[PDB]
Amino acid sequence: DIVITQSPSLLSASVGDRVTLTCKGSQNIDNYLAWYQQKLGEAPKLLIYKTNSLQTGIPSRFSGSGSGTDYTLTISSLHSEDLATYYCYQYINGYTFGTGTKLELKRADAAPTVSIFPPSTEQLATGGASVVCLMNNFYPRDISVKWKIDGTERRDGVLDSVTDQDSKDSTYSMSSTLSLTKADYESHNLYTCEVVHKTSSSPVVKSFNRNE
Amino acid sequence: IVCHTTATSPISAVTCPPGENLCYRKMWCDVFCSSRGKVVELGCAATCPSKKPYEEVTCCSTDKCNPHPKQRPG
Amino acid sequence: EVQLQESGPGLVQPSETLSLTCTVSGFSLTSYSVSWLRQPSGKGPEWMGRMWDDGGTVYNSGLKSRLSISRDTSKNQVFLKMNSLQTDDTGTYYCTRDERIRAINWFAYWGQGTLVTVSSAETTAPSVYPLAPGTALKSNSMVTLGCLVKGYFPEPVTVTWNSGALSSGVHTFPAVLQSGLYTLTSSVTVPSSTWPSQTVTCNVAHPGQQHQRWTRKLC
Amino acid sequence: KSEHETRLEAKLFKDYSSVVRPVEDHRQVVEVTVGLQLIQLINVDEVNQIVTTNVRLKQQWVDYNLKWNPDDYGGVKKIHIPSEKIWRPDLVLYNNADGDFAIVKFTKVLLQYTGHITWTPPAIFKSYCEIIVTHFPFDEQNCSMKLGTRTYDGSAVAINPESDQPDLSNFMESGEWVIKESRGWKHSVTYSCCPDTPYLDITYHFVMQRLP
Ligand SMILES: *[C@@H]1O[C@H](CO)[C@@H](O[C@@H]2O[C@H](CO)[C@@H](O[C@@H]3O[C@H](CO[C@H]4O[C@H](CO[C@H]5O[C@H](CO)[C@@H](O)[C@H](O)[C@@H]5O)[C@@H](O)[C@H](O[C@H]5O[C@H](CO)[C@@H](O)[C@H](O)[C@@H]5O)[C@@H]4O)[C@@H](O)[C@H](O[C@H]4O[C@H](CO)[C@@H](O)[C@H](O)[C@@H]4O[C@H]4O[C@H](CO)[C@@H](O)[C@H](O)[C@@H]4O[C@H]4O[C@H](CO)[C@@H](O)[C@H](O)[C@@H]4O)[C@@H]3O)[C@H](O)[C@H]2NC(C)=O)[C@H](O)[C@H]1NC(C)=O
């Protein structure tokens, strides 16, 4: 069948910018090329069919062009809700899809709101302890977390996850859960979460000691 | 001398080459005659060419004098 | 008004068979075609087959021997059946409504998707532990609390805050796999006036093993 | 599979019109590739200088609205359909020496998934041959056949020879005559009706010579 490659694979751009995505076929497509948008958790939405026909209920900023083997999607001025993954696909000779272009928005710097939580009493009964630190709403995605137990850093038992950009403000959030045994947990006293990011010269520090 | 010609399409007004003084118009019905009318041929000639009983040919020695009948000569 | 809803079993073991349902509203299946697509893990979408408007079917030739597609028009439902499963088949499965010009078709409307995961591991219930702050400095306009949803399988898990009263003040974090088992956090930021006074409660649900939890936040 | 073939034909022809030319925009021209196959001389009238030949009138063009995706119809890449169901350029043979236009039998076309139509309808044509008087110890005559569209003009339909000569690959030869020479030439023809409008023909001749 026809093979499709999309570019740019990851794209950065500020709001109001004009962006163009490209879809290149391995053989002639003859204008039977569609474009759809996919935000996370939501049903994919067709934007354009037959190279340049706008699907009904789609904004005017979206438009398509191309012929033969080379097609483009344009968003004339980028909005914040346009944060999504864009896929092209081909419907004359089987059905093949592009790899997909992820759109990340350029933004000003935001500092994380940092907060630490002690392991719950319900949890401790099971013989495990999870300590969690939450860094909400920051930009860029350039953030190092560091756990320390009685002043020395721990690295075993830490699991990190970062969200995708928010639809509204275009920030990220992170959570690191440091998980231990109850034995290892109460074998120490000071528990401190240390957050490094370009919006502060020295690290933002949150900790709980014992019970407070 | 400048003769119209049906070598090209549309009909070009080519300069008739030396050794050939005349221009012409040659008309006849082919199988499409009742809808399209008579076939039209235009060109140069050394002498004014043959007129077969079905065929019909007219000649001239001035410039651009052999046009399509629905267009102006001269 | 055009909508599609896919329902399936979260977990299926290898050698078992998958059966999916697509439930449709806003049109009839007698005048529109419906296709099944899937997108496996770390892969692009592929078309699996079609339930034609006229009642028949067509399949992707590579999957033809494993598949069957059917519908009950009186229920506004399309069904997919798939056998001889393998870990490759883990992914998200979509039903689409197809649009046509002469003999050419394309995919016009999707359902949200259902996550299908193929694994020998058995379904496991999450433990929903509270996350509450130890310190309370001011009576200011923001305070963050959370729920730790730990020790479940398979995905997904759904999390809401005081039912629908949450909006874009909430973060739910992507789950991480540790020892063959998923764990995840959610958080919500509310005013310091609101929190101690009102009762905040996250609502966790893991359909895969029939759990619907509610942990009231303690101050 | 015939279930797939049946469905294909119904969807190809539900919204099809055979009256309109199969182009996307109406200013475009339908390109038709033409070839004459000579099969056999069947009658030779040396009094009235007429020869009757069995020919095939090979025609090739793309019908935009007849494309399909082979994946949709179980991998079917081509079908046979009756020529009476489709648009045709209405191509005819003339200087037919008794009766104006030669009657061409409507055989099935081969339709491919790309919209490509191949049609090779058989016909019987009476050429009026001219005697060649260049040098005749052995006799020679020159027989001709004109091809052209009956209604459409050069701007609606363009005809193009597939080759310089008639196709003789299926020609069964005579015991008395031999085709010494043959060619196909294309012509723009101007008519008295239409000063600005080109018509088009292709004229195939062959010179036959008597064997000693
Ligand atoms: C048996 O009976 C049959 C049926 O009666 C006889 O059939 C006749 O056979 C002869 C062949 O002997 C044919 O003559 C040749 O015709 C072709 C085609 O003519 C048509 O197309 C021409 C071009 O039109 C295209 O281009 C223009 C732009 O230039 C474009 O605008 C247009 O849209 C189109 O795309 C037209 O010029 C031409 O019009 C002329 O003829 C009409 C009558 O046929 C008439 O109505 C018009 O008024 C006008 O007079 C027509 O539409 C020609 O290509 C070919 O021309 C070459 O040969 C002759 C030789 O005398 C010469 O006069 C030309 O100058 C030209 O010469 C080339 O070849 C020479 C080789 O010796 C070379 O030295 C030249 O330098 C020149 O070379 C250039 O061209 C060649 C291609 O030919 C190229 O490869 C070179 O690189 C170089 O560029 C002949 O005229 C008849 O058409 C045909 N008649 C019919 C009805 O079928 C048959 O002969 C009989 N047999 C026997 C044994 O008796």
Author numbering:
A (entry chain C): 1 to 212
B (entry chain A): 1 to 74
C (entry chain D): 1 to 219
D (entry chain B): 0 to 211
The authors write:
The nicotinic acetylcholine receptor (nAChR) at the neuromuscular junction (NMJ) is a ligand-gated ion channel that mediates rapid signal communication between spinal motor neurons and the muscle cells. This receptor is also a major target of autoimmune antibodies in patients with myasthenia gravis (MG), an autoimmune disease that afflicts more than 20 in 100,000 people. Furthermore, more than half of all autoantibodies in MG and EAMG bind an overlapping region on the nAChR α1 subunit, known as the main immunogenic region (MIR).
Here we describe the first crystal structure of muscle nAChR α1 subunit bound by an EAMG antibody at 2.61 Å resolution and present detailed analyses of the molecular interactions in myasthenia gravis. The Fab35 binds to nAChR α1 in an upright orientation, away from the α-Btx. The Fab35 binding sites on nAChR α1 include the MIR and the N-terminal helix; the buried solvent accessible area of the complex is 899 Å2. The guanidinium head group of Arg6 forms bidendate hydrogen bonds with Asp54 and cation-π stacking with Trp52 of VH.
